[PDB]
Write a structure and sequence with these properties.
Bound molecules: ligand 5SW
CATH topology: Histone Acetyltransferase, Chain A
PDB class: gene regulation
Strand content: under 5%
Entry title: Crystal structure of the first bromodomain (BD1) of human BRD4 bound to BI7273
Assembly: monomeric
CATH architecture: Up-down Bundle
Structural class: mainly alpha
Number of strands: 0
Helix content: 40-55%
Largest sheet: none
Keywords: Bromosporine, BRD4, BRD, BET, gene regulation, hunk1
Name: Bromodomain-containing protein 4
CATH class: Mainly Alpha
Number of domains: 1
CATH superfamily: Bromodomain-like
Amino acid sequence: SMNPPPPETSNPNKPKRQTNQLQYLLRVVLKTLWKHQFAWPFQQPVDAVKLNLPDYYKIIKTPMDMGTIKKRLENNYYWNAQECIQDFNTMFTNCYIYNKPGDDIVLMAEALEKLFLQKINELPTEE
Ligand SMILES: COc1cc(-c2cn(C)c(=O)c3cnccc23)cc(OC)c1CN(C)C
């Protein structure tokens, strides 16, 4: 019935770096997932008000979405690739916690996560 503030996508107090791995995450991983036919439920924060999900933010206390991850990558928010991978994992895990197995949203998250893992296993060695 009321949405929380969305996750931050900038913060001058957070340490940040540019790495070839973070470049890969934006140019390959995020690009591939963003354009996927099943991307759209994950491209913005869950609007629990508009979607009539009064329980969502009573269950999901660490929200994350690909729109936020996209902005964090574009804004050079991360210190390393593992911080970004964690955000993706939070997004997927939130979906499985809130929804039921076999739900359409869970099947779509599972398809995206399979592709995410295929791309992550080709993550370049840090130069
Ligand atoms: C970000 O946008 C959307 C999210 C969801 C959505 C996402 N996730 C992750 C969920 O767990 C979830 C759980 N229950 C119900 C809905 C969702 C659904 C959408 O449409 C049905 C849109 C589309 N909006 C333009 C309306």
